Subunit: 386 residues, 3 copies
């Protein structure tokens, strides 16, 4: 199940402590065993954001209610609607052709005024991610039940007695993956994505704040059509739900339940501190067989590529030789691997793995394995554009 720890990942001092680096990814786990000591399976479980705070609320499907139009004959100054006293009504002062047929003195421009009640049927919510909202749950399995603990960015360390290992301090910080700072959690009544903060602000839709409950910038979903002497019909523009869904293609969708817990991606770099202890360092070989694409490589909103492979061999457990090259005539590592340890669990028949890499901008080949039987994939990465 869990892949053993390697020699490079731990240092036993001649006197003092034995420090061991743990790379806890959502995919696989790292197990650490020691002579005359119980084996410890280190598996991360929940990378979440407990509770979020709302920043803004844009409206895409607005509905106009009560209308009222007051007009006055030309050469009599201006027209004034008595709904402007209430800031919850959007109004517009215009001019119309006037004559004897409508009931006025001179054939001129008669000033009018038309107000309408602005309400919002369906709205979208934008939420922010703060440091006191992030939690990480790590499970530890023992052989020879389990013991679980949690760590936050405010409390990254955890000390606990683990039997024959004595007191153990586990200091873990979060790395790689997404950058929670430059992102907002966009929420439609159905799904939820992650958008850029500047992309969120720069949006010409009627919005409201938890501090300012009254809607602002409403003059973008309302349309004042051709005015008449009596009634100037103003209508509510169509639902902008389609436009948003069209604008949210390259946005990365995060799983959000009713408790607003945000399941995210990335990895967790942890270091375990123990008393002086010798540890078995297992070293895994290379996969000499051939891999095949389980499906088409997807793409997340942070310029990384998720690729699901399936190994056709029994040399497990081994290390996947995946690299992103420039051309088929170059084995030059012009790409990078987000997944630090791309090992296969067991060697039982046909298994599958979940690897994530960062290819350079432009044309690049995702190549797995070598020799005569290797496969590749032409990938074109787009530049940054909100």
């Amino acid at each position: 199940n869990c892949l053993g720890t390697s020699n490079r990942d731990f240092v036993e001092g001649a006197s003092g402590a034995t420090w061991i680096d743990l790379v806890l990814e959502g995919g696989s786990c790292v197990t650490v065993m020691a002579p005359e000591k119980p084996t410890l399976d280190f598996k991360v479980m929940k990378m979440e954001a407990a509770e979020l705070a709302t920043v803004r609320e844009y409206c895409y499907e607005a509905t106009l209610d009560t209308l009222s139009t007051v007009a006055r004959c030309p050469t009599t100054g201006e027209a004034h609607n008595t709904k402007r006293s209430d800031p919850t009504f959007v109004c517009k002062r215009d001019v119309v052709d006037r004559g004897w047929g409508n009931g006025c003195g001179l054939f001129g421009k008669g000033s009018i005024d038309t107000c309408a009640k602005f309400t919002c049927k369906n709205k979208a919510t934008g939420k922010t991610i703060l440091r006191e909202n992030i939690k990480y749950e790590v499970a530890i399995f023992v052989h020879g039940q389990a013991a679980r603990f949690t760590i936050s960015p405010q409390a990254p360390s955890f000390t606990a007695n683990m039997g024959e290992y004595g007191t153990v301090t586990i200091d873990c910080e979060a790395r790689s993956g997404i950058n929670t700072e430059d992102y907002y959690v966009f929420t439609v009544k159905e799904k939820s994505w992650l958008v850029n903060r500047d992309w969120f602000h720069d949006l010409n839709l009627p919005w409201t704040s938890p501090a300012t409950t009254d809607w602002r910038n409403r003059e973008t979903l309302v349309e004042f059509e051709e005015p008449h002497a009596t009634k100037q019909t103003v209508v509510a523009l169509g639902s902008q739900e389609g436009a948003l869904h069209t604008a949210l293609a390259g946005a990365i969708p995060a799983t959000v339940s009713s408790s607003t817990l945000t399941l995210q991606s990335g990895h967790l770099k942890c270091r375990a501190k123990l008393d002086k202890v010798k540890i078995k360092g297992t070293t895994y070989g290379m996969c000499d067989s051939a891999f095949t694409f389980s499906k088409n490589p997807t793409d997340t909103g942070h310029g990384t590529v998720i690729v699901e492979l399936q190994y056709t061999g029994s040399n497990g457990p081994c290390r996947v030789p995946i690299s992103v090259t420039a051309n088929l005539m170059d084995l030059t590592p012009v790409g990078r691997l987000v997944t630090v340890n791309p090992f296969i669990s067991t060697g039982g028949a046909n298994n599958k793995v979940m690897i994530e890499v960062e290819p350079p901008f432009g044309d690049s080949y995702i190549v797995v394995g070598r020799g005569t039987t290797q496969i590749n994939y032409h990938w074109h990465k787009e530049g940054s554009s909100i």
Copy 2:
């Protein structure tokens, strides 16, 4: 005074160097001694932000000065005040009932125009925290005076010769506590708090910039009352100081002097690099006695709980067994400790400690000690809401 270093916190290689992790918190200090080597007390002192830059200046107590109202008879177009040429005056064009009693031709709507001088008596200042503003001062005591140095996020490392230890490189970065990015330093002439950046922007008060000295969005502290044919009395709204103080309940207050140095919270993780040297590793036991609440546990603006305890025993120096559980029937660590090392200095009679923890959202119990004589505290943490 200072608590000794533990076995886990240092690794002496068979050849090369001896690395030791130092967890420097504002509360206690970490002392490191070695055979035939002088003892070294590592104590952090100043976690500050030297100088800050102002971003905006909101006005809450505005004062209106010179008023002027120009009106014209109905059916004569519009009214135009000659103060609109000066952008430092807020104006409003309205209409009033007019007749023969006031001195006009027809009984209609006479257009008027009323301007007023806008000035700001008392204002609040919002300042930002940049990386070149943060400084950390660390003191080192020797036994057998002292040596002090400073580190910034731009210069986290410090190398200096320390006698028998030879050249010593101390590499320290800041962790946990607050996130200085998503916060602004709000400043009233009296106190100073820390607010969210989005909470700062989304504020409907007249504001000015160091770049734009002229006040903008002033039409929110002015009130145009019922207009008359001669003078339309417009007044300045009451002081919004009370509203701000009401809106700044859950905001964390930071100590700021006239030099704008911001005393903050969190901890400093440092690693000392020395030549190969053996170090005495002192291990402290558990507190078997009973703790009592010195006072009621407070709360900071970053979802953490400060709790002041007092130990009724003489087993010092020992480690405080404080944990945040879900229920009284569960000893499950559902909470976390921001304070990494919650040790007691000496064992002399009744001493006090300063522990800070991060409880999960909702109901949670803060439990100290075990056995028959332990105490707890029901705590309800609120969700994130600017």
Copy 3:
């Protein structure tokens, strides 16, 4: 060429691994050799930002095109220009003196309306820096060709077989220097600087978005002069290029080519993981000679000082004794060094080095060397002010 590794920078466990800390700066490199093992020169090369996304586009040199003015006699309501139907035209309704000479009934205020086509000749571009845009290229030289690799914040680790050293994992994260979060890349058709995000938003110039192609806030580069009964001449304000260049003095200029790759500053902290291996630890002495200023110490936009020195001696390779003190009577390190390892490469005659330090705010002396023949420099650092 490269300075050897020091004893403090590596720990060889009695069993397991040998970890070595590498401080890779743009200036010098760190070479690590081992008995019966080939020497390895670790040199960083490219600290860049591959591709950037545009956020806003301000206009400083606008040009007005087609003008049109429609006026109507007084006591006839208002005037209405038929260009307001097109939102690409900026308009203004004003009043003028009217009489029999111009062709009207009564000597009163005749309402007019003047519109003009708003276009932008030259514009400035503001771009943002995201995590998927940052890349770091590191070169490794071997003696007894070279092997190069890349690392991103999403993929900071790199594992590769290096002959007799076996599998080697190099885990590197970025530290110090600039903070890419609070900065935007300002781009004029000529040069490119780095400005603050709040300084970018708070700017009263006509701006456009990649989402909103139509220009907004144009009423700041247009000037409506004294109006006449026929034509109200409105002109385009002069080029604001001079004002921007005046406002961009303390802004740090980054090298940007046509591929928008941003050459930046700071340093890269890396740790190499290898199997158990003994490493030669070379220790360098102190420079007893005298240094001289090659040129006047410059200043970057992040409150650090670049100083170029030249060593007049042959004691190389040695360590430069540069420190920032308060007064000439105090050797107190009140300043800090951004450059971690300020060593000199060879000792051949007169060589030059590139040191960067962070002096405290206010008066401070940059002192190099000691004894009778040392030199200093009075430096006054300004406070933070956008």
